Amino acid sequence: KKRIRKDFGKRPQVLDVPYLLSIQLDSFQKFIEQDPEGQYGLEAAFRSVFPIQSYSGNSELQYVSYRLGEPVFDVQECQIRGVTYSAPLRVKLRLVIYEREAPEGTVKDIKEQEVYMGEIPLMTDNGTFVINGTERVIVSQLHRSPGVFFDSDKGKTHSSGKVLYNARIIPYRGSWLDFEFDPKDNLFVRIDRRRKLPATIILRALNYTTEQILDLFFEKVIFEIRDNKLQMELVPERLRGETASFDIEANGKVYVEKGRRITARHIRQLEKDDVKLIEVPVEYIAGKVVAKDYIDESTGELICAANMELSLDLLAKLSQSGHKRIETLFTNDLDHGPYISETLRVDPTNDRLSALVEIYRMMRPGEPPTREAAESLFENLFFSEDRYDLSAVGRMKFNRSLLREEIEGSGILSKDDIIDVMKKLIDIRNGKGEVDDIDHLGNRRIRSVGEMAENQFRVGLVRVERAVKERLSLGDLDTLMPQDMINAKPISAAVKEFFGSSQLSQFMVQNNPLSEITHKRRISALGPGGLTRERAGFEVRDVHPTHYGRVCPIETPEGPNIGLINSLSVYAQTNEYGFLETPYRKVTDGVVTDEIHYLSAIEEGNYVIAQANSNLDEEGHFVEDLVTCRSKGESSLFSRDQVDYMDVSTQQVVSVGASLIPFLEHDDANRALMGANMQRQAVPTLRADKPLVGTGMERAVAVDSGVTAVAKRGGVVQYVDASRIVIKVNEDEMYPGEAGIDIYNLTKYTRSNQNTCINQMPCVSLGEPVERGDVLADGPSTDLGELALGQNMRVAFMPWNGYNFEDSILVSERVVQEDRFTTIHIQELACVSRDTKLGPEEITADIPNVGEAALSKLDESGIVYIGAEVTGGDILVGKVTPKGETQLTPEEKLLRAIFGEKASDVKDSSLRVPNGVSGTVIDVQVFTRDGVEKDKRALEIEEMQLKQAKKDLSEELQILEAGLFSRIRAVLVAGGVEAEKLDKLPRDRWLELGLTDEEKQNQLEQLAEQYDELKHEFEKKLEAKRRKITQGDDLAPGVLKIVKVYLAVKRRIQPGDKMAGRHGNKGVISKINPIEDMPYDENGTPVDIVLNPLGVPSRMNIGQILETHLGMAAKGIGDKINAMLKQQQEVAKLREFIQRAYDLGADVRQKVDLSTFSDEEVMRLAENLRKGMPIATPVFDGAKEAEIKELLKLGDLPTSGQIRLYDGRTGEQFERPVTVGYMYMLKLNHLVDDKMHARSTGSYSLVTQQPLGGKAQFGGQRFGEMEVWALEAYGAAYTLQEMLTVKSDDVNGRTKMYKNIVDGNHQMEPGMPESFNVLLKEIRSLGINIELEDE
Amino acid sequence: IETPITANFREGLNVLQYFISTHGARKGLADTALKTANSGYLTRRLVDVA
């Protein structure tokens, strides 16, 4: 018997979501192949800098293969410690020397294998980078293809600017190249977006004469001179949009008479008769423009030069001369406008020389151009990779713009590319052809992380390459390979700048596993100063119809940026050369194949693709002949015979952040935006509980990403600790003995970027054969293998009492009594000691001006131990700082040179706990510079570890002794019984006592070998520990050691915390009302969280309600199959209740009949839907208004949805039932800004008297002009007066005021504010003068 | 657009109609995006005058 999985929406998922880290791994892997050879990425940039050719030396540096050396540390010491992690870059180089100077006899090929050049960071096993200390991730970029386009018009916004077309080239590095027209029908060119210049000034520089230029924008019309008359090679297509200026006749048939216009009908009449020769007057040719030069072949005089317009006089000589081939230009008044013909006239330049010079000054105005500089600059504009490189993909996309055949070529542009492009530009301006699609993905290419890393790497190369040429001469003979050539400085200063200062790259969001994976798989529209800014984007923010199943049109962050980012969808993936190709199931005839194929954005429009919302039984039949199908933007009804391809599922349409949303189709894009962001702002909660409605992506995020630990090789688990999970692999014989030991470290309490804590609680128990791919430990919020951000509580939508006004949330008092929302927060308080004017600072516990409880928790080094119950006021770091002769008193100066120097020279300057927060120490930082001597700091902790390690052996040797000796006794007694005799002599003598010849003696012998062997292994085990502790020391980028104490405060649910579900209903907790007033059902179970029903009419998000009815009726829909049919097989006291209480509720033939099916039958009927424990609901193809209602009458208890409750205050019958259930909500993390900012009297600035915060004292709130006009509006005068006087600036005001309030009286009237003084003084010093006047 | 939408929020809203409404959904939220940064820009031009 075989059946269906039975779930909401019939959309079988054939190909599960691939690796989500395919955007980071695949890209950065091909970029820098550490393990593999050398190809693509960095290698594609080495063959453009290493091949250096410096004259007067003849040196050729050949490239071989690059191999990344040894890293710094692992991946855990980059967070718990202060490791920057920087892996050096070494490449194999084998250059040859051909000296060309004085006869020295130096000829050899010395091979310097590895050479250190640049320090580029690497990617973690997941897809993140580390530079300074915090996790840093590079977001991909998306802009217009580095080639050519044909938009509408620009620059003419102020004036009219009618009927004007133009083209634009948007490179990545170099100068711009534009081509626009003016009302005078003239074409120009903009280099680097500067002043306008003739569009024929760049052509002449490319070795193009006046005659050639004319034959690059217009077609040539050959005129023949025979029988003393003028003919012409007639072309019907060229007569489109022209008036008959003559009698167009051929073969004695007048097709078009003089007078009437030439329509599209007369054109086909000429193509049919194959008319390619007619008679044309002289006036018709007079309106044309001669291409080349034509001189009289009878006299030798010039008749007319090039570019010059023909006339009735010039043509009169061209006919008498004797020419037979007249090559001119074809121009009319419509689809062939003389634009270029009028460009050569307005061009000052006349050749190549005048062009190169004119451009040089236009680019670098100042020093007089030369013969070599003028040519060098021009070649470095659009004809050199070291200054202008359109990558290796730009060429491909540039070819499809001019309808080219091949797609391969060079990165730089040629003299034929620009010309061919300008040809189409004229066609559009004329009338033939239209514009191009910009938003189309065919142009907007995605820039992978690898490529991005190469972008900031190619820049550092052209900077160091300018130094290897000079230093080449500084080399003696053949030793200029190591450091005597290349410098790893210009490169580092170019790459490091992008990993921090760059706006494109920002801090990694690690407040949640799901929030991390959505950061890597993210696309950005902002980048270098060669693209777009933040001021404009009304053409890039808006999603284009072509962006289907390749990017979620509603995955952009909510706040300052809306539509500027937008992450990447699910199934979509950056293929090979930018072109994003989303999977499509190839379906032949009426049979769907399980095969998948990645179609291009330009190839999709060539085939008709069906949809996922179509009914399908299996994969060999089709439901209905006529089904809704889509093409490339339109909608039409196609048959199952016309359908060539079909979408994979309703998942590729959105991202992983929106795929988790149960009812996304029921939600509007408006609130759906925030709904995906609420998951991005999630926070690791204690009680991790998975939603009561999963889609099938909660288990993919944890596995693929670096969230859940995965075994390396199958084996048998022997032990399971919270900090480590050792796996005894049976590489040899099957025995409990040690063999393939592979320790797995689980990150417990380490500080992340969003001040969160990532944990990994082991799941595997004692003795459990694990398989390759099985889970070993959980994650920050994962339960077992799936994802669980928030929790599941009882929700009851009802306007309580004012509290839930706008976006407020009411929760019972039981929420604080239990740590269900108690999250872990970690704050870092760095304390650095720098050089003082009196000498370097010291880190000791000797700090005066403190209490006993302060130095109590502190050791004999000033650093507090681990696990201290610190609080607001306690000292975390024991730092000291000298005072100065000015701060010294004659009393403490005498004892300074008597009782020693270290008596009263230093003062109190330690790091304390910020006012308000109060937690405990979880991790202390240990550093001690060798140049500053290893004092008691690195000695005490060391001694402690030596004592612990020694104790770790005494305990192991105790169990090993009392574990084997307790076994050899039961063997010795057998045969040679010695009860009262064996318990006398020492334990080490029990080995000397033999036993009668027998196989039993062999046992005692083996146990004697195991004792010595194992013991010898534990002795050396302690030795290894006494090495790492007393070996090398790692320091921080700081100076004089750094003590970083991490504070952890239990952040309970208090008024101010914001929570939201997965629909977009964001709100903040109001007041924690007791379980007294809050309503409750007739069967106890009080309501946990209450929302406002008014958040539905305005905020269009009905979907959230669908989840409510799904949570309440979850005890009778799909979860019922696994909450009754599964529990009855376990407990024998339930199998008697489930079989009867089931049929009484659900009488559907489709459902499983417990009465008919046996214990074995039902078991297999619960494995088909095991993964979907809390039912299953896809994105845009799942639940239905008809399916849901039917599933609510199958189980307990209410009907139709709503149910009659009771008021918690009154207790009477609640008028009319209400919608209740279990909605899956989510708590949002608490940012630093959430921390209360209390300030009353702190420190002030120097130049200005404005209060300034920092570490201890909190920063004061600003009172902008906006707030100024507020009090300025009211009749109040003294309020706003002191607001910017006694409060802040005025120094004499903050003193008198405080001295008056403490007395009991009022403060003296505001005198002269500091602002009045400072400003006034800034005037007297000038030429003017301001003076206050009385009445 | 010449192709209207029939499906609504209640019933099964396909991926097509949901994509169409996104066009008009991008505008609204992208408007207040630059106003929340500095809403005292427009007011400044008036207050400093009268």
Side-chain angles (χ1 to χ4, degrees), chain A residues 1071-1097:
Chain A
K1071 180 181 179 181
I1072 176 180
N1073 297 168
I1075 317 181
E1076 307 178 13
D1077 298 356
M1078 289 185 174
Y1080 49 87
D1081 299 355
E1082 60 284 343
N1083 188 202
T1085 173
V1087 55
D1088 298 357
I1089 300 183
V1090 178
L1091 291 67
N1092 184 15
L1094 294 171
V1096 175

Side-chain angles (χ1 to χ4, degrees), chain A residues 534 541-548 553-554 556 558-563 566 611 613 630 634-635 650 653 664-670 672-673 1100 1102 1180 1185 1189 1265-1266 1269, chain B residues 1-4 8-41 43-45 47-48:
Chain A
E534 298 288 3
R541 300 176 184 180
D542 302 347
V543 58
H544 189 87
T546 304
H547 290 86
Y548 178 86
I554 196 60
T556 177
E558 177 68 12
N561 300 353
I562 300 297
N566 183 5
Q611 288 298 342
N613 64 354
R630 304 302 179 272
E634 302 296 345
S635 60
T650 181
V653 56
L664 182 56
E665 58 177 359
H666 307 265
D667 298 354
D668 184 28
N670 296 1
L673 185 157
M1100 299 180 297
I1102 187 63
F1180 297 99
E1185 60 179 0
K1189 298 182 179 181
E1265 55 180 359
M1266 298 181 298
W1269 308 312
Chain B
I1 306 181
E2 61 179 1
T3 59
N8 60 179
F9 293 85
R10 179 185 181 92
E11 301 179 4
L13 204 293
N14 60 358
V15 300
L16 293 310
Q17 301 186 8
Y18 184 88
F19 183 93
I20 301 181
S21 178
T22 304
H23 297 270
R26 184 79 67 177
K27 306 176 183 178
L29 291 69
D31 184 9
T32 183
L34 291 305
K35 296 183 177 181
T36 57
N38 185 199
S39 182
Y41 179 86
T43 304
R44 178 185 300 181
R45 296 285 67 91
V47 292
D48 298 355

Side-chain angles (χ1 to χ4, degrees), chain A residues 927-998:
Chain A
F927 289 99
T928 301
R929 184 177 183 179
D930 188 13
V932 195
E933 177 179 0
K934 303 179 60 60
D935 60 354
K936 301 175 61 177
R937 173 56 179 169
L939 292 179
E940 294 182 354
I941 302 178
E942 171 183 342
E943 182 178 1
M944 179 180 299
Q945 299 179 3
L946 271 295
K947 180 179 300 181
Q948 297 180 181
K950 181 180 180 180
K951 182 180 181 60
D952 294 355
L953 181 58
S954 61
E955 60 181 1
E956 291 176 348
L957 294 181
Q958 180 179 0
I959 305 180
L960 192 160
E961 180 179 0
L964 281 62
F965 282 89
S966 62
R967 186 65 179 90
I968 62 88
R969 181 177 181 178
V971 177
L972 182 57
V973 170
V977 50
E978 299 182 0
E980 189 181 357
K981 294 300 178 180
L982 183 58
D983 60 355
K984 289 181 176 178
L985 68 169
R987 308 300 294 268
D988 61 0
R989 187 63 62 179
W990 295 16
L991 302 177
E992 301 292 350
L993 182 57
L995 194 156
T996 306
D997 56 348
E998 187 180 359

Side-chain angles (χ1 to χ4, degrees), chain A residues 1141-1319:
Chain A
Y1142 187 96
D1143 297 1
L1144 298 177
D1147 60 358
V1148 179
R1149 300 179 180 180
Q1150 301 180 0
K1151 299 301 179 180
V1152 177
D1153 186 6
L1154 287 300
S1155 299
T1156 299
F1157 297 91
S1158 61
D1159 298 354
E1160 301 179 0
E1161 299 293 344
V1162 178
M1163 180 181 61
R1164 298 182 298 271
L1165 298 176
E1167 301 294 345
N1168 299 355
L1169 38 58
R1170 180 180 180 180
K1171 299 182 178 180
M1173 178 71 61
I1175 73 89
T1177 299
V1179 188
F1180 297 99
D1181 184 13
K1184 183 179 180 180
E1185 60 179 0
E1187 299 180 0
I1188 299 179
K1189 298 182 179 181
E1190 185 276 349
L1191 296 170
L1192 271 51
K1193 302 178 181 180
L1194 300 180
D1196 293 350
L1197 179 55
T1199 302
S1200 181
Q1202 298 182 181
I1203 186 263
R1204 309 177 184 90
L1205 277 56
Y1206 294 94
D1207 187 16
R1209 302 183 302 270
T1210 303
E1212 66 180 0
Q1213 302 178 181
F1214 196 96
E1215 301 180 357
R1216 281 154 265 86
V1218 294
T1219 300
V1220 299
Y1222 296 92
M1223 168 176 293
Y1224 170 78
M1225 298 182 60
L1226 173 54
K1227 177 182 177 180
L1228 299 180
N1229 63 348
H1230 297 93
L1231 188 57
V1232 180
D1233 298 354
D1234 296 4
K1235 179 176 59 181
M1236 180 175 299
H1237 306 273
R1239 178 179 180 88
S1240 181
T1241 301
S1243 181
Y1244 304 91
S1245 182
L1246 192 283
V1247 54
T1248 182
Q1249 302 294 162
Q1250 299 180 358
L1252 180 56
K1255 301 299 180 179
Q1257 296 72 22
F1258 299 92
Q1261 180 64 21
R1262 297 182 178 90
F1263 191 83
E1265 55 180 359
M1266 298 181 298
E1267 292 70 22
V1268 175
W1269 308 312
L1271 299 177
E1272 179 179 359
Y1274 288 82
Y1278 301 89
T1279 300
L1280 183 57
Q1281 183 182 356
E1282 63 177 358
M1283 205 63 176
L1284 299 312
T1285 304
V1286 180
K1287 290 297 185 61
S1288 180
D1289 197 0
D1290 185 11
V1291 52
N1292 190 205
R1294 69 171 67 97
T1295 59
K1296 300 300 300 179
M1297 186 283 301
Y1298 181 86
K1299 296 181 300 180
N1300 294 175
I1301 303 301
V1302 296
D1303 296 358
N1305 297 352
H1306 58 89
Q1307 57 86 223
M1308 184 62 180
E1309 294 72 24
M1312 50 180 59
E1314 184 65 16
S1315 61
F1316 175 83
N1317 299 355
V1318 176
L1319 189 160

Side-chain angles (χ1 to χ4, degrees), chain A residues 75 779 797 827 1019 1153 1215:
Chain A
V75 301
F797 298 90
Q827 180 180 1
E1019 294 181 358
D1153 186 6
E1215 301 180 357

